[PDB]
């Protein structure tokens, strides 16, 4: 019946949503008419990370004596992702949406005088999110430099050099 | 536009649904007023397996030249799972529901003369499912023998002996 | 002459009090007419942890340029602890009492604009306390399930399975 | 209801008292305006030893079929310890006070024809105490030789050479 | 154009200033008419630490999407440092000046509702600074005890025993 | 009061200036809208080298019986560096400026009949500088060949192939 308790359930749902969107990006880049497998695997890894982030909120809820209450995991906003630049731009926005949600949870915890929840967020979530935003930003800058979307050689090269070989 | 292609997308959605239900069972058994941690971890492992099973269907779809099309992952049917017997009975039914879906996909593949899809299902899915159904059945029999739901000592003992220590 | 300085001295005293209560629980479970040695050793380990927590506050005080000022360590509230359920219920309440004291120190540090002290508490104390509260809660639930206090077989079994073998 | 049983409880209380005094000496020497860290760590180790000596009496009481009965642990006689010479002189007196208590327990055990308790004391306590008294005596002689309290160079040197480096 | 962004640039400049002052202290103690090489190396290590602390703020600025803007690194306040006591007293004041700047940045971040920056400071800066202040304080106390500035034997001994051998 | 002594102090200041400029180039290439991390790390390494070169002059001054006298470290000439070609061209000019200063010091040492200083410069500085000038020259030629500044694919490729992976 707690506002933080409900907020955490919402946050867990959002992490699950983010994981599913990344999974969609993985599937797209794996397609035979897309076929950027390093880019695919980058998004697969991000999907697994976000699911791990959801499971951490489940654990926190239970340690906190709250109840985990699950809702539908909504499908991603798109069925196809265009190319590496468009997908990275959507990822950036997704990470920012998750970041603002985290920051909103932190403001709630602050108002509710819940320093344990403030620390949890600061220690387990906020800096990972700053890192992911920076790295995706950096990728977008490079994709622009490489001439996306028009420059297919540049897109091919990004897949080889910018993302780890899978 | 393929019937097998759509069927595979449906199957992938069902695997994701099954994974989410298991995740719910994990969260429940982790609760401070439930507190059967081996049972919790058993269901967590099943959730991870079902997600892996979804990802295999994504890979198959793409290798097949189909398109992965995602839908909402519906929340589990219950928010709380009663006890170890009730949760295992629900797991049994979930596994049977997934099994019948797999078998229905197999009948479709058979009609569509798709031996590759028939083999995929037979080699990667059907026997795992027979194993999971047997093991859950066996657990139910033991939980009954142990006096569930009334016998809380028996439920405690099941957690110690029947499921691997986490 | 600082309010945080005095508060820290009080907190150190409380940690020492908590350690002593745990030591009493250890001694009780070691008795020849109690004789639950795993349960005894669980409480002995908690006593050593709380003493370590007191010593950390001494170190903090000194690094902070404050003065460690000691008071009497009051004897535990009880001379005998009933059984494993009663002892765990008292431990739960003790952990909650220490937790509220920590949280009160944190509110003081927050008012006094002492982020270093806020971090200390958040990084070294608050999450350990959430863990201990969860684990004791979980034990109480299990002890209830096992039929305590009446079910001596259940109490025997708890000692074997729930607490680490000493 | 035993005289030896009560005597042991008193002895355990005294060991706990001695440990707490040593802990106070540790805290003092750690202070930023005292800052003799080897001397601090020497007294910290003595505090841990005395606590171990208390726990041995708890074990003995329980093996003996007696009951451990705890009382308040009184705060040390001083809040500040002067310097290394004054602290060592107080330690010497504390060790002698504990030694006389042990010897008094031994006389009681002798009167009560309790050779097991006599052996316990002789084998686990009396010789450790002779060693500690000798070593502190030896330190006092050296601190005098070094010109304490006036000779701060001598006090600095004692910390470097006489007590183990921490 | 951010107040935190400018504040971080100022903080980075101050860290660079602190590093340069330490470098000056290193050079002084290396002189043939000063010749306290352990003391020299202590200040050299502190200079390298402060430069590392500046580079961390550059990294933070960039991850934060701000711009690193550099200003002149002002020369140290003194060209010569007297002796080990005077140098340590100046170091103490320098560390306190850096600490107050950090704490002021933290107050700004708090007002601007920037918990990520609050955590950064608390996790990477504030406790290191408490440690450095304590250790220098402790050194000053010892240098006083050793008879500085008049007691050149004491100063020689400090170099041998208090600071690590280089 | 020596001309070589003052000259060395000037030289040390210039090395510190050069290190700071390189640090600025590092920060620029790390930016989210620049994002050439290998190029960033190349300039970071050059900054650390130049600081090491300053510290060597401090050591030389002191061994020589001179006094290290520090001045302000002036901020770099630019706040932003354009792109990899512009930054390399500025680095080339910076290295040449340091080289001419070294050569001027050498002429002074030669006039002052200071073969030890001549050797120092020849053995520790002049050949490193010839190497750095060659390597930066070579980079400029390649950046031109790659089509800088207009060819962003070429700039991306330079970062991958020409500078070591960080
Ligand atoms: Cl709400
Ligand atoms: Cl709330
Ligand atoms: Cl939701
Ligand atoms: Cl995680
Ligand atoms: Cl779409
Ligand atoms: Cl954001
Ligand atoms: Cl890149
Ligand atoms: Cl269909
Ligand atoms: Cl078909
Ligand atoms: Cl579906
Ligand atoms: Cl699988
Ligand atoms: Cl329900
Ligand atoms: Cl079935
Ligand atoms: Cl079984
Ligand atoms: Cl107060
Ligand atoms: Cl205060
Ligand atoms: Cl108190
Ligand atoms: Cl601890
Ligand atoms: Cl009682
Ligand atoms: Cl609480
Ligand atoms: Cl349990
Ligand atoms: Cl008596
Ligand atoms: Cl007796
Ligand atoms: Cl007593
Ligand atoms: Cl012992
Ligand atoms: Cl006193
Ligand atoms: Cl004696
Ligand atoms: Cl001695
Ligand atoms: Cl400002
Ligand atoms: Cl701001
Ligand atoms: Cl500035
Ligand atoms: Cl650092
Ligand atoms: Cl001066
Ligand atoms: Cl300060
Ligand atoms: Cl010596
Ligand atoms: Cl020595
Ligand atoms: Cl010292
Ligand atoms: Cl000149
Ligand atoms: Cl000259
Ligand atoms: Cl100059
Ligand atoms: Cl060098
Ligand atoms: Cl500029
Ligand atoms: Cl040149
Ligand atoms: Cl090249
Ligand atoms: Mg909470
Ligand atoms: Mg919808
Ligand atoms: Mg939100
Ligand atoms: Mg606040
Ligand atoms: Mg962190
Ligand atoms: Mg991440
Ligand atoms: Mg993220
Ligand atoms: Mg096919
Ligand atoms: Mg619904
Ligand atoms: Mg079906
Ligand atoms: Mg067949
Ligand atoms: Mg098979
Ligand atoms: Mg299976
Ligand atoms: Mg299954
Ligand atoms: Mg403080
Ligand atoms: Mg009382
Ligand atoms: Mg309180
Ligand atoms: Mg933590
Ligand atoms: Mg704990
Ligand atoms: Mg605790
Ligand atoms: Mg006896
Ligand atoms: Mg009193
Ligand atoms: Mg006595
Ligand atoms: Mg003996
Ligand atoms: Mg001893
Ligand atoms: Mg002793
Ligand atoms: Mg930020
Ligand atoms: Mg000036
Ligand atoms: Mg300031
Ligand atoms: Mg905070
Ligand atoms: Mg920390
Ligand atoms: Mg430090
Ligand atoms: Mg510092
Ligand atoms: Mg010379
Ligand atoms: Mg200027
Ligand atoms: Mg010149
Ligand atoms: Mg010549
Ligand atoms: Mg050479
Ligand atoms: Mg070089
Ligand atoms: Mg160079």
From Swiss-Prot, chains A, B, C, D, E, F:
Domain of life: Eukaryota
Binding site for Fe cation 2: 50, 95, 129, 132
A GO BP entry: intracellular iron ion homeostasis
One Pfam match: Ferritin
Class of enzymatic activity (EC top level): oxidoreductase
CDD domains xref list: Ferritin
Coiled coil: none
Gene3D superfamilies: 1.20.1260.10
UniProt-listed InterPro entries: Ferritin, Ferritin-like, Ferritin-like_diiron, Ferritin-like_SF, Ferritin_CS, Ferritin_DPS_dom
Family indicated by similarity: Belongs to the ferritin family.
Subunit structure: Oligomer of 24 subunits. The functional molecule is roughly spherical and contains a central cavity into which the polymeric mineral iron core is deposited.
PANTHER family reported for this sequence: FERRITIN (PTHR11431:SF54)
Further information: There are three types of ferritin subunits in amphibia: L, M and H chains. M and H chains are fast mineralizing; the L chain is very slow mineralizing.
Protein name: Ferritin, middle subunit
Highest classification ranks of the organism: Eukaryota, Metazoa, Chordata, Craniata, Vertebrata
């Amino acid at each position: 019946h707690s506002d933080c308790e409900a907020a955490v359930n919402r946050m867990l749902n959002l992490e699950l949503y983010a994981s599913y969107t990344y999974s969609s990006m993985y599937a797209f880049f794996d397609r035979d008419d897309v076929a950027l497998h390093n880019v695919a695997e980058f998004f697969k890894e991000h999907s697994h990370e976000e699911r791990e982030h959801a499971e951490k909120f489940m654990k926190y809820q239970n340690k906190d004596g709250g109840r985990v209450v699950l809702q539908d995991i909504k499908k991603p906003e798109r069925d196809e992702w265009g190319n590496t630049l468009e997908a990275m731009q959507a990822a950036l926005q997704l990470e920012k949406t998750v970041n603002q949600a985290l920051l909103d949870l932190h403001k709630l915890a602050t108002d509710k005088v819940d320093p344990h929840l403030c620390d949890f967020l600061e220690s387990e979530y906020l800096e990972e999110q700053v890192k992911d935003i920076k790295r995706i930003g950096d990728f977008i800058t490079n994709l622009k430099r490489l001439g996306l979307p028009e420059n297919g050689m540049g897109e091919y090269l990004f897949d080889k050099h910018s993302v780890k070989e899978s």
